[PDB]
């Protein structure tokens, strides 16, 4: 493998985790994570799209709710999709990655 | 300051850095990282392209010394910004932004 | 600079932060932070904070507090009553932070 | 599994890696890694340099890869965790060593 692609997030879920099961039986979870920065000339929030697979996805479905504080270690992935044109979404994907609930 | 938003990358510039002066400098370039896995059986490979943006001294350093193919270490944060393109379509871009608490190191 | 020296910790304070003032007047906080892998084994990390963050730690942190630490490794040499001793600490530098995560361990 | 214990290093080997094989059969490698930072004292204006030497330990394939390809002065990327281990020395002194340990879930990457 060439280079390093690593994301570390701590923040709060903006909604309940959505868990879907793949025909194979592999769990997949999605949720958004808020991080913010406040400074004096001000507050700016960043919303991260997190994707979890397998057991970690199942853990998210059991235990995570809107407002839950989690730690995320994942990788950046930009994927192309089209809808009713070309759209691109950059996600934080947990594959070597971990998820830990902090409350 | 509320939560943690941290990106760490090691990779190679996909082109020469674009440097513009505002007085603070702003530089941008793309970074390739790749993972290689073996098929279930051939050595396969996928590259990920990251959009990096630098501000101040780091941007100026990038313009001086970085070129297409340079290997760098980046520590920054994620920012998704919205723009409408000239067709009226709302578009979003996620970039890796290196401000003060971030670094860039040439390897 | 030359190379990268980065430690990232999430865990719980082993004791109350010890805050002392240096001759210079700068604040310094010291405490231990526990991390564990599960068979279960605990790693105790020696954390050192300086200035405003150290005072913040003394005000608001207690034994059992969950914190996030971003710092760097420093091994410092000190002699005992006369053998040479070394301690490796996680020191929160310019580019580092400490963030209170809320919640606390019990007994 | 409880909390987070992560070290990230980029630096240069201070020696060739020593690779011993355990009786179990798994390889173990160790070497020291130098990281340095340079800054100008904001109060005094002086230029300052400080080097930090890290003790790295690798297991399994990475240990073997290190023995094959890494040498003194090689630039590597390390991701691992901190471990402090206790030992009494032949003089009877309790001693402590903090190492950067790369197990499963860590990586070692040759740079350049």
Numbering used by the authors:
A (entry chain D): 3 to 43, 50 to 92, 95 to 105, 107 to 114
B (entry chain C): 3 to 24, 27 to 44, 47 to 113
C (entry chain B): 3 to 40, 50 to 92, 94 to 119
D (entry chain A): 3 to 114
From the paper:
Single-stranded DNA (ssDNA)-binding proteins (SSBs) play crucial roles in DNA replication, repair, recombination, and replication fork restart in both prokaryotes and eukaryotes. SSB binds to ssDNA with high affinity, regardless of sequence, and prevents premature annealing, chemical attacks, and unwanted nuclease digestion. SSBs typically recognize ssDNA via a highly conserved oligonucleotide/oligosaccharide-binding (OB) fold formed from a five-stranded β-barrel capped by an α-helix. SSB consists of an N-terminal ssDNA-binding/oligomerization domain (SSBn) and a flexible C-terminal protein–protein interaction domain (SSBc).
We crystallized KpSSB through hanging drop vapor diffusion and determined its structure at a resolution of 2.35 Å. Four monomers of KpSSB per asymmetric unit were present. The KpSSB monomer has an OB-fold domain similar to EcSSB, and the core of the OB-fold domain possesses a β-barrel capped with an α-helix. Unlike Streptomyces coelicolor SsbB, Staphylococcus aureus SsbA (SaSsbA) and SaSsbB, KpSSB contained additional β6 strand. β6 strands function by clamping two neighboring subunits together in a tetrameric SSB. The amino acids 120–174 in the structure of KpSSB were not observed, suggesting that the C-terminal region in KpSSB was dynamic, similar to that in EcSSB. Many hydrogen bonds and salt bridges were formed at the dimer–dimer interface of KpSSB. As compared with the crystal structures of the EcSSB- and Pseudomonas aeruginosa SSB (PaSSB)–ssDNA complex, we found that a GGRQ motif occurs at residues 114, which might be a regulatory switch for SSBn or ssDNA binding. In the structure of KpSSB, the GGRQ motif interacted with Asn14, Lys74, and Gln77 via several hydrogen bonds. These GGRQ motif-interacting residues (Asn14, Lys74, and Gln77) in KpSSB, perfectly conserved in EcSSB and PaSSB, are ssDNA-binding residues in EcSSB- and PaSSB–ssDNA complexes. Superimposing analysis indicated that if binding of the EcSSB–ssDNA complex occurs, the GGRQ peptide in KpSSB will break free from several hydrogen bonds and shift away by a distance of 12.2 Å and angles of 130˚ to form a complex with ssDNA.
